[PDB]
Amino acid sequence: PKEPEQLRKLFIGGLSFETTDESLRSHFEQWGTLTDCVVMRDPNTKRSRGFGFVTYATVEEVDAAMNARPHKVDGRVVEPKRAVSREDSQRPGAHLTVKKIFVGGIKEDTEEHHLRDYFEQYGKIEVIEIMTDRGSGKKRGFAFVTFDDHDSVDKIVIQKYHTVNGHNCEVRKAL
Numbered sequence: 001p002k003e004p005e006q007l008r009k010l011f012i013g014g015l016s017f018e019t020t021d022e023s024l025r026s027h028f029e030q031w032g033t034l035t036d037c038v039v040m041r042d043p044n045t046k047r048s049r050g051f052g053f054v055t056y057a058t059v060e061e062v063d064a065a066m067n068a069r070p071h072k073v074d075g076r077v078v079e080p081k082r083a084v085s086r087e088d089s090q091r092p093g094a095h096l097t098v099k100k101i102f103v104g105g106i107k108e109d110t111e112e113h114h115l116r117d118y119f120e121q122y123g124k125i126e127v128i129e130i131m132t133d134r135g136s137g138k139k140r141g142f143a144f145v146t147f148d149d150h151d152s153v154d155k156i157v158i159q160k161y162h163t164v165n166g167h168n169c170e171v172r173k174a175l
């Protein structure tokens with residue numbers, strides 16, 4: 001059972017106009033088997049649009065490619081991004097590239113270390129903010145986690161489930 005193809009794709013932005021299907025593939029095959037690899041071009045001029053896509057055979061290969069950033073492809077540092085659902089987008093077909101998540105449903109007994117221990121395996125955490133009531137100081141049952149990079153957030157929001165401190169949590173991109 002293969003993971004859905006959408007979860008195995010990387011958009012590669014910022015390409016050199018000299019990058020080709022072949023040179024993009026040669027580069028990105030270092031991190032996995034590529035089932036597809038295309039440079040987007042103008043339909044009339046064939047001039048590169050400056051972005052392309054690669055599709056790996058597995059999600060672990062996507063992760064390996066993302067963990068090997070920064071990627072300098074044909075002399076230019078490119079911008080890889082994995083796909084997320086429309087619910088974590090501001091408009092169809094656009095990526096909301098952010099470093100912060102909202103975590104809801106954690107109630108009053110969840111502490112900073114619960115969030116750190118769980119989320120640190122998705123990326124490097126810079127800020128954990130457990131939200132408390134402005135008047136009483138009581139925990140409100142939600143938090144924000146800020147990472148050093150957007151791929152952590154992208155991996156997080158595409159999971160169907162997050163269980164933190166025994167709670168089934170709602171997690172979404174923030175700001």
Ligand SMILES: Cc1cccc(N2CCN[C@H](C)C2)n1
Nearest residue numbers: 009011081082083093094095
């Ligand atoms: C497959 C994938 C992953 C991440 C972003 C992304 N896109 C945003 C930039 N514009 C292209 C056409 C779509 N596509």
